[PDB]
Amino acid sequence: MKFNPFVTSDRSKNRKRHFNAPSHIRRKIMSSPLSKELRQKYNVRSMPIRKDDEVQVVRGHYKGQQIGKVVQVYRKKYVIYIERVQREKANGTTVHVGIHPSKVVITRLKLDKDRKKILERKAKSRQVGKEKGK
Amino acid sequence: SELAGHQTSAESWGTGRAVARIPRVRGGGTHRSGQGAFGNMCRGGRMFAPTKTWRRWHRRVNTTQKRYAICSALAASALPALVMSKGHRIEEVPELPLVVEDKVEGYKKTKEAVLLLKKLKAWNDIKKVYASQRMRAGKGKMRNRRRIQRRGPCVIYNEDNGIVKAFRNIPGITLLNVTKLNILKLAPGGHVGRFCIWTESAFRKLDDLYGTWRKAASLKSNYNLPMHKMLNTDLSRILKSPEIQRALRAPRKKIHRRVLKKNPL
RNA sequence: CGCGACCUCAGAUCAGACGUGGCGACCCGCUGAAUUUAAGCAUAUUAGUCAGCGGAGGAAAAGAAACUAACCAGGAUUCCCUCAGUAACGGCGAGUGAACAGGGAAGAGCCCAGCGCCGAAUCCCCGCCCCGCGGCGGGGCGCGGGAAAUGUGGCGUACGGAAGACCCACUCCCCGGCGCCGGGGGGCCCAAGUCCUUCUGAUCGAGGCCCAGCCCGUGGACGGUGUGAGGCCGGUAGCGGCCCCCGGCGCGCCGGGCCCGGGUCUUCCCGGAGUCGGGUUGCUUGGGAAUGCAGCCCAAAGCGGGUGGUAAACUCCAUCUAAGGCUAAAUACCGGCACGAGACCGAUAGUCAACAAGUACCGUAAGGGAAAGUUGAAAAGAACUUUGAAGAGAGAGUUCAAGAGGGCGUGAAACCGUUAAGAGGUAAACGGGUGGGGUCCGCGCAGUCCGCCCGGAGGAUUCAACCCGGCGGCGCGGUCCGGCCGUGCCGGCGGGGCGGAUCUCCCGCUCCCGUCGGCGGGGGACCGCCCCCCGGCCGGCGACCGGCCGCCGCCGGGCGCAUU
RNA sequence: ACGGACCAAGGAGUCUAACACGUGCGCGAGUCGGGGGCUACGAAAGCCGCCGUGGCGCAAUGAAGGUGAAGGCCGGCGGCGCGCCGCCGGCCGAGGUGGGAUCCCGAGGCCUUCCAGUCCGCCGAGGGCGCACCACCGGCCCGUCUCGCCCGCCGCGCCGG
RNA sequence: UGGAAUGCGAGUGCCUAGUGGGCCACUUUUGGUAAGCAGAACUGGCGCUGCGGGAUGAACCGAACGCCGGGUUAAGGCGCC
RNA sequence: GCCGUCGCUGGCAGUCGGCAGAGCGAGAAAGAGAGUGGCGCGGACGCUACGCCGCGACGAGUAGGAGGGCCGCUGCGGUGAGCCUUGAAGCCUAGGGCGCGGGCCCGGGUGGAGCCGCCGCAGGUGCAGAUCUUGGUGGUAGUAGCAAAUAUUCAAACGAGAACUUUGAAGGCCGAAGUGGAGAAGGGUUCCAUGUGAACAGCAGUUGAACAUGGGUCAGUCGGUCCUGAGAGAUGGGCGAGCGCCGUUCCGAAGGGACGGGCGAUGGCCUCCGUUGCCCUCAGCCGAUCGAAAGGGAGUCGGGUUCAGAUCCCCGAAUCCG
RNA sequence: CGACUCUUAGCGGUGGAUCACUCGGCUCGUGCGUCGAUGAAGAACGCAGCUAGCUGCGAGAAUUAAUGUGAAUUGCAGGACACAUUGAUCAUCGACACUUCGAACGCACUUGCGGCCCCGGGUUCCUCCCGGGGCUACGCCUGUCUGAGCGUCGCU
Ligand SMILES: [Mg+2]
Ligand SMILES: [Mg+2]
Ligand SMILES: [Mg+2]
Ligand SMILES: [Mg+2]
Ligand SMILES: [Mg+2]
Ligand SMILES: [Mg+2]
Ligand SMILES: [Mg+2]
Ligand SMILES: [Mg+2]
Ligand SMILES: [Mg+2]
Ligand SMILES: [Mg+2]
Ligand SMILES: [Mg+2]
Ligand SMILES: [Mg+2]
Ligand SMILES: [Mg+2]
Ligand SMILES: [Mg+2]
Ligand SMILES: [Mg+2]
Ligand SMILES: [Mg+2]
Ligand SMILES: [Mg+2]
Ligand SMILES: [Mg+2]
Ligand SMILES: [Mg+2]
Ligand SMILES: [Mg+2]
Ligand SMILES: [Mg+2]
Ligand SMILES: [Mg+2]
Ligand SMILES: [Mg+2]
Ligand SMILES: [Mg+2]
Ligand SMILES: [Mg+2]
Ligand SMILES: [Mg+2]
Ligand SMILES: [Mg+2]
Ligand SMILES: [Mg+2]
Ligand SMILES: [Mg+2]
Ligand SMILES: [Mg+2]
Ligand SMILES: [Mg+2]
Ligand SMILES: [Mg+2]
Ligand SMILES: [Mg+2]
Ligand SMILES: [Mg+2]
Ligand SMILES: [Mg+2]
Ligand SMILES: [Mg+2]
Ligand SMILES: [Mg+2]
Ligand SMILES: [Mg+2]
Ligand SMILES: [Mg+2]
Ligand SMILES: [Mg+2]
Ligand SMILES: [Mg+2]
Ligand SMILES: [Mg+2]
Ligand SMILES: [Mg+2]
Ligand SMILES: [Mg+2]
Ligand SMILES: [Mg+2]
Ligand SMILES: [Mg+2]
Ligand SMILES: [Mg+2]
Ligand SMILES: [Mg+2]
Ligand SMILES: [Mg+2]
Ligand SMILES: [Mg+2]
Ligand SMILES: [Mg+2]
Ligand SMILES: [Mg+2]
Ligand SMILES: [Mg+2]
Ligand SMILES: [Mg+2]
Ligand SMILES: [Mg+2]
Ligand SMILES: [Mg+2]
Ligand SMILES: [Mg+2]
Ligand SMILES: [Mg+2]
Ligand SMILES: [Mg+2]
Ligand SMILES: [Mg+2]
Ligand SMILES: [Mg+2]
Ligand SMILES: [Mg+2]
Ligand SMILES: [Mg+2]
Ligand SMILES: [Mg+2]
Ligand SMILES: [Mg+2]
Ligand SMILES: [Mg+2]
Ligand SMILES: [Mg+2]
Ligand SMILES: [Mg+2]
Ligand SMILES: [Mg+2]
Ligand SMILES: [Mg+2]
Ligand SMILES: [Mg+2]
Ligand SMILES: [Mg+2]
Ligand SMILES: [Mg+2]
Ligand SMILES: [Mg+2]
Ligand SMILES: [Mg+2]
């Protein structure tokens, strides 16, 4: 149950703030769980998805064990495009099929200075909570 | 809104133009011109008797009657038949009323609360709240009321030392402070017989809060329990007693059905 | 004549400032109807309301009595409850209509002119130096300028005030700089299943996840994601974490300002004028021989003046102190900024406006003012072949579905085409009664099921009767033991809580002499009720039970092995 | 005689206030906290009691000043002359008549082999206490009228009863 | 000997809607030449009411009404319709 | 016979069982009374008492009243371990039924995501009408009609397609108060080139002022610009609660200018002249301002040139003002 | 026969009811409670590579700077020697900027006429021309300067 007086649980307000979210907020909304190996390694559960990440599709027609590179994060449409997750049009040209980030698992992360900073911050806040309970 | 239907300068054409005499929108050059207006039979008009914010939404209930209602709810909460007839799965609860030691007032983790309900055999009631969780039919979904579920046990405590935070995440559970009991919580829907779990300290304050028959309430300035109109409700035992039985005439249980009339001639 | 002061008045693109317009929900000042009611209508009502004009602020206005009262008196203003639909007004008709007291919200009090004393002790601006400098100020220095005796500043204002004398008591209070130590806004982050089967176009669905109970839970709000999700993502929870900025509260240094009070006596001083008040006129009010306001005329007093709800004279009383000024809070808020919620509506509804809506469009203008939501999970939005000038078609293909094909979810009625069946010269339709024919249904077509009994064929986790154990019911066990227990009754050196408009050794203040009486605060006793302790009767355990004993029933296991 | 060509959707006794009566619930000569205060759902609910101010009810009547809701018997004395009035002490005491649901008593009576006489019940002429309610008759309180004789005193009155 | 017959259970109180245009007939009856005219009394109707008969018809005659079977009737009928 | 209403304010707690004993409907009060002396283990249903059962009578209805609805609609508290992608709502149906009825159930189809029962609460809760509102659709009806102003015809071309377009040729009309050539007001891109032939152009179109893609307006001299006209309109002033209004020379210190002269200051082609400050001298205009693309108002003509502009561009020849 | 007509049903149309959805309303509550001559509200015209409307912005014009964020924006193209302490994008927003009218301000309201000061280019010291910049509205307060009067006077 929610008790914060300044947080709305209104359905219309929560959908409007999802579908009008600005680009830097859609990034956070567009987050994917990490693999079991990555989750153990970094102590992080989810990361915002990024171009050049390698993911597994775990839901839908294209689910399986195939790992593909993230080739486009279409934040406007709330989907990512993944290598080999595609189909053909009538004229035979191949077109990418959009997958929501919540339906993939990140197997390899595209690491740079800022990404290593974000992983570190997430892992530290987690440990503060674990010691708080302990 | 008090303006709905009235933000126009519509005027009746009057008779003679072969149309009904409803006030009509003025001007021209748009679909709206010459259409009906204002009246409650018109599209875009004003409704009949527009609702007002000074409808009397609130009701006064006498204190003596509200306390009467809290007493009936508690009396009906200690009878297995009424609690079972309220839908609560109390077929294995050791006793009714269910009183648990005061340690439970100091629980902190939700897992302790769950385990206690399992050893008190109040977990079947919770599992029935999980089975009743579903979506609500109608516009309520559009109005922040999408999920419906049945009420579970009510836990009544004397002092809160983590018990509220322990129990509040278990669906169907309602916490109540014994000194601030609510009929809306003790008789949900207006039906008596909600399953209540009592802490020992909460159970011991009841006499003070509502008074016995001999002793007036100590925590209410002037109040005592409502008196009974019938001291022995066991109608069967009254009727089968020798005193009543000796005063009766013998029953007449022979049926005298209609007699077909045969012509004597 | 000239020169120079002052006064009154001019011009400056003079130096530096300030006002204008907007918005207007709430607020203040004006002005101000008529629909309407009176079953007509003129007073009245509507209504001090709509419209009109001016002026504001985060609130405004009001406000520290020329008050209420008539009490044993209260004590600024505003608001809430009540007073009260009352006193009163009113073609005394329709209708209208307050206040005081009482209970609350809030609570805060002050300052001039005057009368006086102080050598104008006062103020503004320019120039230079130090400090600060996006709220333009602090200090220092100018034989710098001006204002101001046609009156600035300090003391002081009705609760009295001042000066002097005598007793008593005094060192912290503020201004401008500088340094150090402990709510608000923003940013980032923090639990747990995408586990095994399985349904599906896809699923968040169903089933399961050892004892024990998949895992987390201070988090099972909500949203998203190809259903329907606490555990997939964002979130949610948490006196959770980290990082910025702003503020508030504290402590020291520097340079300034103040040189500060109480009581008792002595002597002095003390107030707002074309205003009050009166006449009259008009408006206004519940205010009635006139409540408030305004115009004109008259026009004050100083033990006076005003009020004292019926005009006036006389006379006592009570109560204030007008004609100058400031003041937070409690109160209001359909505008604005930012939020939260709902027993509301759900695209002819709800705002006119769910959408390129105050838009398109109409009017010279003031103004008037709509219609209009939905493919799909995903555009995968139909390549290619073929007829046609093309629109359109036929195939093909995508999709779970185009029997979803770009104004595409579903897809009603009216109305229309076609197919099928029936029928047809008193328009059609209609009630009742049959008959014929259809469409489909009985998932019909040798026709029910059940108890007991007789007989023939079989087969057994085989019957009764006894034995062991468990459980249950009942018992007037004619009167067994133990319990709890009486919204029962009696006896107590019983250990206590509540109440009393029942009575009465300790102390605080205070009148009188160190005495002695009163107000207030406290024991104690007594009375009623209740709780807990112990003894005696009766008494329940059918809203309230255990052990033994007896009877009965049931179950499990033995034995009975077959005319059952 | 008027409206109605046809189909869909919309479309008209509502809400606030006041009053009256009926009904249901709570408490009851009381009752009501509504305003105020205290202590996610919750703007809820709980509480106040030296917060019951206050409303309504518990008293009416008169324009008002005002007044404001049973008596009798016994004994004693004073005055008038057995009866009356005034003042003193003791006893009883909220009226009566008719009707009146219900309740109470009970003349007599409710069978089995025949008599006596019991316990529990049961019916019943007649007789009683009489609810509510109605009719009638008395009484009491306030306004007003007529008649009339007394009683009180810090105020001896154009006094008060 | 509840003091004529016959029949029938009565009394009482609150609140209350619609109505407040009527019209027709036997008999009586006013005005009028009269009127399917205007205006009264009494009772009954229609209004509010179908049903059998008067071919048809607000009021005439019979009779009043739940959904049925059988029987019998009223007023009216029985050449054919 | 059946249904309902009313009445009997009728009957049933007695289902009192092997701790047993079955009855109380019958013309005519009150006990199936209690006592004291003289083998089998068995026996239907019932009773949501707001239930169940019996007997008798009755049944018209506008206006109007009342009752009961397990009639229907939307939402709220409870409950149904309710339903549902193995298919919700909605919709359709010569399918099977239930109910006096309001209505409801089930079958089949379509549909694609939510919905309902019961106890209570609440209401913007039930349509045939209102010359009702809004939207849609009929018959009329392939009907009225596409008739004002004399008129067309031949050949060819493009083209899928020609009565209507283009070219040529005939026959006609307007008949210089034009159906010609140019402007003002108004329009605002309609102008010009190319393309289209969906919609529109009340037949058609190969065409258009439609649609689409791109272009096109050149000035000292032609207008505006300036003047004043009838008039409008600030200031001073007056009035006015006030936004403001009256008024335009009227209650006004209404000139910011000048030939010249005298005092200075600055500069430069520094010789002496400019500029500049002050003083002297001189000074009616007497009403700010707006007001005309037809009035007043200097000065441009010839030729050529484009798809569309030209007294504007280019060539030539001029001219006014400063 | 067969048309036509009527009824019912299948299918197909016309139509957009119903149902389910809701980034919209409506109502209540809370906190704050801030416009302008430093030029507001409002209006006009512009601004994008392809851009009509809406939206946003103002010749620095679908935005500059800064801070946070941390790899996009996206309908297509493109990538400035755009791309990770050489920072995409979004957000915040304190710096800078902000055309014309409008209280609207030189006078007028036609993009009409000026005046003063300074600067630059023609020219060549002044002039003259062109361009740029700054000023030039009403009221009103304090002060300043320059004045006026047969106003009151003083000395001459
Ligand atoms: Mg509306
Ligand atoms: Mg629904
Ligand atoms: Mg100046
Ligand atoms: Mg009237
Ligand atoms: Mg009237
Ligand atoms: Mg009238
Ligand atoms: Mg009047
Ligand atoms: Mg008035
Ligand atoms: Mg107004
Ligand atoms: Mg105004
Ligand atoms: Mg203003
Ligand atoms: Mg403001
Ligand atoms: Mg005042
Ligand atoms: Mg006060
Ligand atoms: Mg009253
Ligand atoms: Mg009034
Ligand atoms: Mg008061
Ligand atoms: Mg207070
Ligand atoms: Mg003074
Ligand atoms: Mg005072
Ligand atoms: Mg998570
Ligand atoms: Mg599962
Ligand atoms: Mg979820
Ligand atoms: Mg979801
Ligand atoms: Mg789960
Ligand atoms: Mg989280
Ligand atoms: Mg948090
Ligand atoms: Mg004063
Ligand atoms: Mg007036
Ligand atoms: Mg008046
Ligand atoms: Mg008087
Ligand atoms: Mg003030
Ligand atoms: Mg719509
Ligand atoms: Mg609408
Ligand atoms: Mg519609
Ligand atoms: Mg709808
Ligand atoms: Mg609409
Ligand atoms: Mg739709
Ligand atoms: Mg489909
Ligand atoms: Mg579809
Ligand atoms: Mg869809
Ligand atoms: Mg649709
Ligand atoms: Mg469709
Ligand atoms: Mg058909
Ligand atoms: Mg046929
Ligand atoms: Mg009519
Ligand atoms: Mg008609
Ligand atoms: Mg009542
Ligand atoms: Mg709330
Ligand atoms: Mg007549
Ligand atoms: Mg009638
Ligand atoms: Mg009748
Ligand atoms: Mg009849
Ligand atoms: Mg005849
Ligand atoms: Mg018959
Ligand atoms: Mg005949
Ligand atoms: Mg009837
Ligand atoms: Mg059909
Ligand atoms: Mg869908
Ligand atoms: Mg509603
Ligand atoms: Mg309807
Ligand atoms: Mg309709
Ligand atoms: Mg024709
Ligand atoms: Mg011409
Ligand atoms: Mg021409
Ligand atoms: Mg055509
Ligand atoms: Mg053309
Ligand atoms: Mg003027
Ligand atoms: Mg001009
Ligand atoms: Mg001209
Ligand atoms: Mg030339
Ligand atoms: Mg553009
Ligand atoms: Mg930037
Ligand atoms: Mg950046
Ligand atoms: Mg002009």
DSSP chain B: --STT-SS--EE--TTSSS--SEE--S-SSTTTT-B-SSTTSTTSPPSS---TTS-------HHHHHHHHHHHHHHTT-HHHHHHTT---TT-SSSSEEE-GGGGG--SHHHHHHHHHHTT-HHHHHHHHHT-EEPPSGGGGGT--EE----PEEEESS-SSHHHHHTTSTT-EEEEGGG--HHHHSGGG-----EEEEHHHHHTHHHHH--SSS--SSSSS--PPPPS-S---HHHHHTSHHHHHTSPPP-----PPPPP----
Q: Which residue is nearest to nucleotide F83 (CA to C1')?
A: B134
| Å separating the CA of residue B25 from the C1' of nucleotide C31 | 34
How many Å from the N-terminal Cα to the C-terminal Cα in chain A?
24
Q: Which residue is nearest to nucleotide G31 (CA to C1')?
A: A6
Q: Tell me the HSE value of B144 on the side-chain side, using a 13 A CA sphere.
A: 7
Separation in Å, CA of B107 to nearest CA in chain A:
15
Contacts of B105 (CB under 8 A, 6+ apart): B157, B158, B159, B160, B161, B162, B163, B199, B201
CA angle B148, B152, B155 (to 5 degrees): 135
Chains A–B, number of C-beta pairs less than 8 Å apart: 7
For residue A14, the chain B residue with the least C-alpha distance is: B144
A128–B contact, CB cutoff 8 A: no
A10–B contact, CB cutoff 8 A: yes
Beta strand pairing status for A104-108 and A54-57?
antiparallel
Q: What is the distance between the alpha carbons of residues A50 and A104, in angstroms, rounded to a whole number?
A: 12
**Both tokens of residue B96?**
């009714």
Cβ of B53 less than 7 A from strand D: no
CA angle A3, A7, A13 (to 5 degrees): 135
Q: What is the distance between the alpha carbons of residues B108 and B99, in angstroms, rounded to a whole number?
A: 19
| Ligand 5: centre distance to CA B46 (Å) | 26
CA angle B138, B140, B142 (to 5 degrees): 100
Contacts of B194 (CB under 8 A, 6+ apart): B73, B77, B83, B86, B88, B151, B153, B154, B185, B186, B187, B188
Q: How far, CA to CA in Å, does A91 sit from each of A83, A86, A87, A95, B130?
A: 20, 14, 11, 11, 52
**Both tokens of residue B220?**
């209410």
Separation in Å, CA of A1 to nearest CA in chain B:
7
Cα-trace Rg, chain B: 32
Q: Torsion-angle region of residue B182: left (phi > 0), alpha (psi -120 to 50) or beta?
A: beta
Q: What is the distance between the alpha carbons of residues A133 and A3, in angstroms, rounded to a whole number?
A: 21
Resolution of the solved structure (Å): 2.7
| Ligand 35: centre distance to CA B217 (Å) | 64
The answer to whether the beta carbons of residues B122 and B93 sit under 8 Å apart is: yes
CB atoms B144 and A1 under 8 Å:
no
A9–B contact, CB cutoff 8 A: yes
Return the DSSP state at A129: H
Residues of chain B (156-175) having a beta carbon less than 7 angstroms from strand C: 165-166, 168-171
SS3 for A68? strand
Beta strand pairing status for B154-157 and B174-177?
parallel
Q: What is the distance between the alpha carbons of residues B38 and B47, in angstroms, rounded to a whole number?
A: 8
The count of other CB atoms within 10 Å of the CB of residue B201 is: 16
Please give the helix or strand (H or E) that residue A74 lies within, else none: strand A67-74
The count of other CB atoms within 10 Å of the CB of residue A119 is: 19
Q: What is the distance between the alpha carbons of residues B95 and B120, in angstroms, rounded to a whole number?
A: 10
Q: Tell me the HSE value of B28 on the side-chain side, using a 13 A CA sphere.
A: 0
B169 CB neighbours in chain A (<8 A) are 1
CB atoms B168 and A9 under 8 Å:
no
The answer to whether the beta carbons of residues B178 and B156 sit under 8 Å apart is: yes
- Listed residue (A67, A63, A65) closest to A52, CA to CA: A67
Torsion sign across C-alpha atoms A48, A53, A54, A59: positive
Q: What is the distance between the alpha carbons of residues B136 and B110, in angstroms, rounded to a whole number?
A: 28
Strand G bases contacted by the protein (CB, 7 Å): 20-28, 68-75, 84-85, 87, 89-91
Return the DSSP state at A20: T
Cβ of B145 less than 7 A from strand D: no
Q: How far, CA to CA in Å, does B16 sit from each of B13, B20, B28, B38, B138?
A: 8, 10, 20, 21, 48
Where do we find the tokens 């980030």? A101
Return the DSSP state at A17: H
| Ligand 60: centre distance to CA A15 (Å) | 26
Torsion sign across C-alpha atoms A15, A16, A19, A25: negative
A3 CB neighbours in chain B (<8 A) are none
SS3 for A15? helix
Q: What is the distance between the alpha carbons of residues A11 and A106, in angstroms, rounded to a whole number?
A: 30
The answer to whether the beta carbons of residues B126 and B155 sit under 8 Å apart is: no
Nucleotide nearest B124, from its CA to each C1': F81
- Listed residue (B8, B91, B77) closest to B45, CA to CA: B8
Candidates A11, A14, A15, A132: best to mutate against B (most CBs of B within 10 A) is A11
SS3 for A10? coil
